[PDB]
UniProtKB/Swiss-Prot annotation, chains A, B:
PANTHER family in the record: PHOSPHOMANNOMUTASE, PHOSPHOMANNOMUTASE 1
Identification of the protein by name: Phosphomannomutase 1
Functional description taken from the UniProt entry: Involved in the synthesis of the GDP-mannose and dolichol-phosphate-mannose required for a number of critical mannosyl transfer reactions. In addition, may be responsible for the degradation of glucose-1,6-bisphosphate in ischemic brain.
Organism lineage: Eukaryota, Metazoa, Chordata, Craniata, Vertebrata
Gene name linked to the record: PMM1
Keyword check for ATP-binding: no
Family: Belongs to the eukaryotic PMM family.
UniProt keyword NADP present: no
Gene Ontology CC terms: cytosol; neuronal cell body
GO molecular function: metal ion binding; phosphomannomutase activity
Amino acid sequence: ERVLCLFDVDGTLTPARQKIDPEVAAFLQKLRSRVQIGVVGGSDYCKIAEQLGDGDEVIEKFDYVFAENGTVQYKHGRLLSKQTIQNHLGEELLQDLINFCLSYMALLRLPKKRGTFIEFRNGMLNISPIGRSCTLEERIEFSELDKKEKIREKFVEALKTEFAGKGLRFSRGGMISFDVFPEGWDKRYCLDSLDQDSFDTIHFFGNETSPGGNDFEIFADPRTVGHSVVSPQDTVQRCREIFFP
Amino acid sequence: ERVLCLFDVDGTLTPARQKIDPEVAAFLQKLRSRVQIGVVGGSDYCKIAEQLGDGDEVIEKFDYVFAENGTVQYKHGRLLSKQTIQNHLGEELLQDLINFCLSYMALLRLPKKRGTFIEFRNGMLNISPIGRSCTLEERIEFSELDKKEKIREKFVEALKTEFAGKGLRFSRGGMISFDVFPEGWDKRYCLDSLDQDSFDTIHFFGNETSPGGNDFEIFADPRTVGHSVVSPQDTVQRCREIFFP
Ligand SMILES: [Mg+2]
Ligand SMILES: [Mg+2]
Ligand SMILES: [Mg+2]
Ligand SMILES: [Mg+2]
């Protein structure tokens, strides 16, 4: 009878990278009268916050906010400390990775390069051949070339082989980047903390729950009751059926 | 009888990287009753702003704010547009530079690497072997090793030779980095805009006015009356002598 509803954000609660619909937002607060609610997203906290309210409203509107897949956690309004990727991987593998990337990207010739080719986050390294400090038009330009030349895909193939057996995973970061993260630091990461919070049931809702999707692992994990949705409206209706029948 | 007093910030108006003394700040506002006043600094606007007031007070307290040596300019409260380094250098030299740096740093093995090894600014590229996303203790650790191994100094020697004749200049960026900027984009850069503003006299005040110092060029430029100071109190007294005799 302690229940948590845990939601992916993009395509589950909001249009991708955009603000939640007030009606959906209103339902979630009602749902809170029956269960605790939480969000888990790959984006950083500032982005998620911006999609789910004004200011830091989000940490008050939700019982849990898991940013960067739960490597950053807010619990009932309070920021918890997070394990760092350097602490987890150790400095030597981390620098091996970094130097391989620097070396690989040195040899890539693009139309434009900018800066912040490697962004050190909590949950991962974000790798971007063009550089994260590019403009929107520059992103589209890179994106178009990337499809033609498989720039990010070939980079990732080289990295996976190079680091075979060493516990690194890779995922697409939009148009211009990819993430490198430790094995297990997908959305499931947040389930480890949730494990200590005495929930009787954790319901997870996501829109990418098929193999390869960024919700697959947390959806399939035996610690969650999994729910597959196709839209914020679908998520609301599913919740109505389960919790307000 | 249109006069501008233009001040370096660090060691000229404030302790380096710290907040201005209220008494100095008070005098500068008085000085404004006789002349226009402006600041020019290598740091970015957010840093300079933070040293010179709360919020964006600075653009109201000074007639001109030249951040990153004037590549960013506020004039009487208004942000002016700025030429970009890519526009000035062109994409091919820019990427030649970037790829040389990526390649060089790939081969450097440090105690720790983080991220943002190349930060694209308006006025320059900031190059950091450890990565700009490191903590203060990590900066000191790098700093100590850098002195032992001449990491940044050797990097810069290699860059200068490689790009000989191509109009690039280099300067120390604290403990962990160096800047790469186009020839002429030292503090003198701000004098070009000032040239169109019909000042009868521009007085420049700086604490690094000897050859090699970051105020030397603007101090020595024939467009300024140069003043060499050793402290914020010295700057105030010099101004008193000249403008309130
Ligand atoms: Mg989604
Ligand atoms: Mg499950
Ligand atoms: Mg100074
Ligand atoms: Mg002069």
